[PDB]
Amino acid sequence: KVQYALTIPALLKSGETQRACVNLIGYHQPLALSVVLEHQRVNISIFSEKVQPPHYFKCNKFMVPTVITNAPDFVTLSVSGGGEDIKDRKAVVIAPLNTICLIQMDKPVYKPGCKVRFRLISLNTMLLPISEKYTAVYLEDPSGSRIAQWQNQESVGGVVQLEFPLISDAAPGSYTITAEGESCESARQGFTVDEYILPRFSVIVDPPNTISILDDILTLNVSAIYTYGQPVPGSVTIKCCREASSICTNITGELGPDGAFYGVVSLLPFQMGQSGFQMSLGVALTVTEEGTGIQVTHQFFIMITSQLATLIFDYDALKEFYKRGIPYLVKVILTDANDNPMANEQVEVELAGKTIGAVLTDKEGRAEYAIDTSSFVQENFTVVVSYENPHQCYYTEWEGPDFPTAQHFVMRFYSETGSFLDIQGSSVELNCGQVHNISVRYILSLDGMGEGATTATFYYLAMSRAKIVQHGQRDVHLNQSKSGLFNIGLNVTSDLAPGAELIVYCILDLELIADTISLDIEKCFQNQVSLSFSDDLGPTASNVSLNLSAAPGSLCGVKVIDSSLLLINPYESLSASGVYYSIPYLSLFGYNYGGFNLEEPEPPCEDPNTVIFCKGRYYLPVSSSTEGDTYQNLRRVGLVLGTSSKIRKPVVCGMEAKLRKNFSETFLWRLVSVDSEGQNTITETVPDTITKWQGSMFCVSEKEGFGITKYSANFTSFLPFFVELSLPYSLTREEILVMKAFVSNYLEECIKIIVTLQPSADFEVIPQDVKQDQCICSGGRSSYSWNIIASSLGRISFIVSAETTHIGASCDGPSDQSQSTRKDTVIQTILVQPEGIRKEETSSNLVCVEDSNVEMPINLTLPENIVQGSASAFVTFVGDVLGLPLSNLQNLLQMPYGCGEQNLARMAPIPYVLEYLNNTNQLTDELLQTAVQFLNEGYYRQLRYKLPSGAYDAFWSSPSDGSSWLSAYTFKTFEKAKKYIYVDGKIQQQTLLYLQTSQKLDNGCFKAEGNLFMRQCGQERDLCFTAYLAIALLESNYSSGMTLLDDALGCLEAAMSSASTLYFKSYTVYVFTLVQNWEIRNTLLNELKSKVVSERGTLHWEREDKLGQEGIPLYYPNYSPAEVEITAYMLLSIAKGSDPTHDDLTYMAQISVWLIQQQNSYGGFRSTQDTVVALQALAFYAQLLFKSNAHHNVFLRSEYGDVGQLNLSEHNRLVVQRLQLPEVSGNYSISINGTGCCLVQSTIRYNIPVPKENSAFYVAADSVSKNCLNGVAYTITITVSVSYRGLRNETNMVIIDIQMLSGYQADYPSLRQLENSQQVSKTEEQDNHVFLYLNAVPLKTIQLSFKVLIGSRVLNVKSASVYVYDYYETGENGFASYSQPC
């Protein structure tokens, strides 16, 4: 006879080689086989062999033709021979496959100020590199807007390397990535960038997390640590209790040796064992400090349990089918409390309703019994196990059983002739390169394969992902009668991916009996990599050598990362399992694939009313609904058989189925290629940070594949001799500060040390007369200190030193030849600044000389009551009119930034100045690069304030329903500045749509949102906003056909009779110049020209604020910021004329000289909204006046001699000439000769001691101590009061900046508390100044309060200053003093 079997997967994978296995047996004459995978048109030739005598088990390769959409095909088998011929036809589905794109994100957690290092990898379905082209690689901020994009990223070796710096702001959240490709669909990825906050404490506690009722002691192992690993002396108090139904205890302790508290808590006061239960013991632990009153609180709940003993079923062994004659292996796992093994115990197993086993455990709660399954013909067979011991404490709560109990429900396994195969499953990860010997048990009954032959062959098959690999045959000699086991020599290799399913079957005479399991294989990646450093230990500035080897001809990307991250976010992208799980169809399940059943029709149902004469009684057929046989053993692995033998159970009708570390950057990111066998040496330089240096790589090759390293190589860099200095940021003149130098020894031998401070003449040092050579040893640190007099000015550097005379063997034993000399000197910086506040006085001038000479003097007069020693006289020359605001673009104004409008002053005038430079043939490559960098940084900073509604608002920390004016400003600036840097079009579209929806048409006028920007225009706020919206629309390159623009022009047309405001008239003039008009613009500017204020050679427009024209109630400040904006629009409008005539160039000069007069030493004029417009107008005006050569030589003289002889030319046209007068009270006179226009600026810088003598913006600051001890107080509390006493309608956004009291620091929790509370819109700290942005300050006094810690202690502390000023009008300001509470 002929018995045959095809084994093929049901779902073939297109384009990759698979295997088909054939199992012919029984025949005697030679045969001729043919297997064809009938595609649409072509015939494949899987087998075309001449088969010869019996036992033909061969499994042959074939290539699946590539197909783009899953399609069903047939497999035909022919057995043509001399005798019987067999024809068979099964069905399979050929499926398509994509290519996989992966993102390697090194440094899993990111912080602001870092560099995100991409890596795109494209792979075939088999892990091989392919060339891939990308078109839409870009990032996305948590707000959902694209930040950066790359175009046409071509892959060189299947890997694309990208970099992206992250701005110092870096809005915390989860940035995402999109990487669209010609084959991939979306290679999405995520970030976990978090705000870098470093709390001064970190408390560590590890509760048992579960306590039994019969427990009397609860032990706590709690400690606390600083940020940099220092002990925290103080008091730790812990209070724990619980509620009862419908008592508390508390203990305290002290620490200090190293930081540790063994907080034993007795449960006797607690009602453990009584009705005062709540199943949860709450615990609150608080740690404090002796000096500072700051405390850290940590609360956790400890579970209260009652089930002391637990018995469970391990669902790895203990299969769900029972076979006749094969013992059923019952394995029970016994654990107590928090999952601990048990000693010798008896678990009683009930088979059906009677205990049969009484199994003793194996000293680890791993008990096993062998239920004899012979003569079981039932269909359910529920086995139950229990922990019967009438001594344990088992008081259940949910009215459950009184002893641990588990139940397992099984099924019956069918086989026609009577024979069964079982495979002893494995519950461990099988390693690569090792032959394994999985065991198979078999019952092979009589009346089956045939008595008289004591030999049986069991065929053997494995399935890795969707393909058959490692076929085999194991033949057994039946020396005994019918039972036993044999070993399967499986050869696990890298070609078996995770999840390899094993199949063993035997074909007896008419029955094919098969059993399958689901082995787990470790991930080996068919490649080998041997990343390894050349030394585990080294100094902090050593030359690290790295020796990597892999498969020949491999492109191989390396990475070295601080492992401090892996203790925070242990989720590495591109792990050993992510790659493998990114593979389609790695474990077939059934026959339903792509909407195709692939299942042959069921056989006919046997009639259940036909009697049977079996032994002596009539019988009737019966079949279980839920059962298992060979067919359900397959159809689960996924194979397709075509055997003649029976593989399905019979069925009868009527019974159917129915962040705490300062980790540094990755210092190598190379992508090296491997030459020959592979001995590449990667050489880099280690950074200074003292951490771990775990190294990994992914190492692809076009021939074999890539192998990720398994155990990352580890490196450690440390300094044997540590010296550290702690200093405050700034100090006050003639103040006695103490220096604290920590010297530490990490050598195994005890050492001595001598430390010396280099004396200097700039600053004096108090001779402390302290000298002790402490015999410090391993794990120790000293606290040598010195007294420093701050009798100097400005920047001073402190240098410490060491000599390391040690006598290593303790102190008595001489070192001899053990060490020679260790040198470690650390530089430190200090800035001493005179007492008082800073003041400036700038008088800029423009010189227009045509072969003439100018001898203007310098009119400088230091004010009376001035601090001596703080005085400097400064002179600035620039070769171009708009030349100075080029080196100071990022710091155009000294004001603190952080609001929406404030931020649009470091990127708003840069497009205009760049356009001016490009137009007057002066742009340079590096200057353009710097301008682009500034623009891009500004875009990153400003993108943070965007609301999801599409509108832009200030104070992202305190959102309020968007701000229409700020949205218009940001939209206009982005549209103007999208020529150079990348700008998302969706963001502009969304903001424009928000402007669309912001109709709110009060009569014919638009209405603006927010109430903190046009606070000075009065009731005309709507008209002013409409005019500004029109200005933005015109100068964003929009024609007058838009609906918003047409409506705005219609609104502005009917405004001449009303709108008697000199602020609104300027806006209307500018918009009617932008919309080129001859009559309306002309008559409006003719009206405005009448109200011009004339000075000596300069013309400008005052605010014309008739309401309250006085000088005492805060109206004396002459430099009103408002008039600068109006004059700048006036200059812009007159410049944007039809043809500037000779009678109008003089007007240009007379309006520009005054405007350029109000320019500070940095470029900013008066405020952000003013300096932006002033710079734009100055750029446009200087566009119309330019000299090719512009010869200028300038020299400054005094009554004693000539200071300097500077020269200005084309080469010296964009760099600023800076000079300092040696004498601050001299008699100086400058001289400029040549032709052209130049700027000369003379400034005086000094200090004044808080001139609080007059009526102003009333500010009063005072303080209280809380922890005042022996003089200096550890914690301070500042409370300030602000009130407004001027004559204005309402006030605008105001800032109060407080200078910290010498060497103190801001209390970040207190500042954050002020931020969360709704009194200050935003709080910021930098360089010992804290800025608080108040939205408004009314006549009613506003009181604020916040705390301040102590850093480096200092005595003889002088006063500090609190300064309040309106951000948009610095004329109304107030000063207040601040003193130490003690």
Ligand SMILES: *[C@@H]1O[C@H](CO)[C@@H](O)[C@H](O)[C@H]1NC(C)=O
């Ligand atoms: C090729 O396949 C066809 C079915 O399309 C079938 O006749 C047979 O398997 C092959 N015939 C020839 C002539 O190769």
Ligand SMILES: *[C@@H]1O[C@H](CO)[C@@H](O)[C@H](O)[C@H]1NC(C)=O
């Ligand atoms: C498959 O069988 C054919 C029969 O002639 C044989 O020549 C071939 O080497 C076998 N293997 C492959 C991969 O074709």
Ligand SMILES: *[C@@H]1O[C@H](CO)[C@@H](O)[C@H](O)[C@H]1NC(C)=O
């Ligand atoms: C713990 O706090 C409670 C507060 O009710 C107090 O009564 C008790 O005295 C405290 N424990 C100690 C040891 O002081």
Ligand SMILES: *[C@@H]1O[C@H](CO)[C@@H](O)[C@H](O)[C@H]1NC(C)=O
């Ligand atoms: C913490 O570690 C173990 C675990 O509780 C304990 O034996 C040890 O005594 C504890 N150490 C301290 C300092 O409490």
Ligand SMILES: *[C@@H]1O[C@H](CO)[C@@H](O)[C@H](O)[C@H]1NC(C)=O
């Ligand atoms: C099997 O049949 C018995 C008969 O009463 C029934 O109690 C049980 O719930 C069924 N199922 C299992 C898994 O034992």
Ligand SMILES: *[C@@H]1O[C@H](CO)[C@@H](O)[C@H](O)[C@H]1NC(C)=O
């Ligand atoms: C598995 O067991 C068989 C028993 O004879 C032995 O021959 C073989 O070497 C074993 N394989 C191992 C231990 O890897």
Ligand SMILES: *[C@@H]1O[C@H](CO)[C@@H](O)[C@H](O)[C@H]1NC(C)=O
């Ligand atoms: C297992 O497979 C590997 C890879 O082909 C081979 O090198 C090794 O010799 C095999 N082991 C045995 C025992 O055949």
Ligand SMILES: *[C@@H]1O[C@H](CO)[C@@H](O)[C@H](O)[C@H]1NC(C)=O
């Ligand atoms: C590389 O190492 C060598 C000696 O090991 C030496 O040149 C130096 O330490 C390293 N190179 C640089 C540039 O630091």
Ligand SMILES: *[C@@H]1O[C@H](CO)[C@@H](O)[C@H](O)[C@H]1NC(C)=O
């Ligand atoms: C953290 O980063 C580096 C150390 O590698 C250092 O330059 C920087 O100042 C550190 N910042 C803080 C706050 O410690």
Ligand SMILES: *[C@@H]1O[C@H](CO)[C@@H](O)[C@H](O)[C@H]1NC(C)=O
């Ligand atoms: C390196 O560190 C890893 C961290 O888990 C560790 O498993 C490994 O044993 C260490 N050593 C080497 C040589 O990888």
Ligand SMILES: *[C@@H]1O[C@H](CO)[C@@H](O)[C@H](O)[C@H]1NC(C)=O
């Ligand atoms: C500038 O100084 C030179 C002398 O160095 C003098 O001859 C000349 O007339 C002055 N003026 C101009 C416009 O060159």
Ligand SMILES: *[C@@H]1O[C@H](CO)[C@@H](O)[C@H](O)[C@H]1NC(C)=O
């Ligand atoms: C400028 O000159 C005037 C004389 O008109 C004098 O009063 C004043 O002190 C000088 N300095 C300043 C800064 O105004």
Ligand SMILES: *[C@@H]1O[C@H](CO)[C@@H](O)[C@H](O)[C@H]1NC(C)=O
């Ligand atoms: C400068 O202006 C010219 C004039 O069209 C333009 O082609 C060029 O791109 C501009 N350069 C820059 C850097 O914008």
Ligand SMILES: *[C@@H]1O[C@H](CO)[C@@H](O)[C@H](O)[C@H]1NC(C)=O
């Ligand atoms: C925008 O500028 C382009 C010049 O690049 C100009 O052709 C166009 O008319 C302007 N306006 C609009 C609405 O495109």
Ligand SMILES: *[C@@H]1O[C@H](CO)[C@@H](O)[C@H](O)[C@H]1NC(C)=O
């Ligand atoms: C012009 O400036 C250059 C710059 O080095 C230098 O020759 C000198 O200062 C000037 N030469 C003159 C004034 O002849």
Ligand SMILES: *[C@@H]1O[C@H](CO)[C@@H](O)[C@H](O)[C@H]1NC(C)=O
């Ligand atoms: C400073 O120069 C001016 C020039 O007129 C004049 O007052 C006098 O020569 C000098 N004054 C002094 C030195 O006080």
